[PDB]
From a paper:
The tumor suppressor p53 is inactivated by mutation in about half of all cancer cases. Most p53 cancer mutations are missense mutations clustering in the DNA-binding domain (DBD). Due to its low intrinsic stability, the human p53 DBD is very susceptible to inactivation by destabilizing mutations, resulting in unfolding, followed by rapid aggregation at body temperature. Here, we have systematically analyzed the structural and stability effects of all oncogenic Tyr-to-Cys mutations (Y126C, Y163C, Y205C, Y220C, Y234C, and Y236C) in the p53 DNA-binding domain (DBD).
Tyr205 is located on β-strand S6 on the edge of the β-sandwich, with its aromatic side chain packing against the L2 loop. It forms hydrophobic interactions with Leu188, Pro190, Val203, and Val216, as well as a hydrogen bond with the backbone amide of Val197. Most of these interactions are lost in the crystal structure of the Y205C mutant, accounting for the high stability loss, and there is virtually no collapse of the created cavity, apart from minor rearrangement of the Leu188 side chain. Two additional structural water molecules occupy the space created by the large-to-small substitution, which effectively links two narrow water channels that preexist in the wild-type structure on either side of the phenolic group of Tyr205. In the case of the Y205C mutant, we also used a triple mutant variant without the V203A substitution (M133L/N239Y/N268D) because the side chain of residue 203 lines the anticipated pocket created by the Y205C mutation. Interestingly, the Y205C mutant was not conformationally rescued in cells, despite a substantial stabilization in our thermal-shift assay, indicating that a certain stability threshold must to be reached, which is more challenging for highly destabilized mutants such as Y205C than for Y163C or Y234C.
Residue numbers in the entry: 96 to 291
The structure:
Amino acid sequence: SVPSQKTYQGSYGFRLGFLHSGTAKSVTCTYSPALNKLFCQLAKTCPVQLWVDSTPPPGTRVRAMAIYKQSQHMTEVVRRCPHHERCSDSDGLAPPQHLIRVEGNLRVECLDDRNTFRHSVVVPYEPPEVGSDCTTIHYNYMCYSSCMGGMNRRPILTIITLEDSSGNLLGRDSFEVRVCACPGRDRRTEEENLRK
Ligand SMILES: [Zn+2]
């Protein structure tokens, strides 16, 4: 079983947005539109924008889940490595196995699927505040892409799903993630490789 990654705006015109953070050596999180790839440092704040054309109903939720990008690894549950799952960096709510956490949201729910064993993290959808045109979720990635016994240098995708109160699909978007020491350099390197 592999979760779908098919982009789907749905009835509410759901899609993600990313800040424009640049590629300075010091940047902690940066997004490449050309690669559809987020580059970030370990456990640092990753703002992800939620855009809609119309407001979805009360009880709508937003779920994040990771899958391996390569087809030969897609059936493997993405989880934290044997070191990081035991490093007692708990935030009180996220299970220590979970790669993706949501920062600063007390209504977070952390799911371990009883059938697929995949991890996900879900929060209620809130419409944009006064003076904002979108809503933002702050994500943290809790292992490096290179962590041995975990992602093990394999690329992952994050799948963001807009769901109704039963968990039915309303919209879907996705992006590749690399968790690394120097996001700014790595984004520049991979974008240069793409041009070449
Ligand atoms: Zn790790």
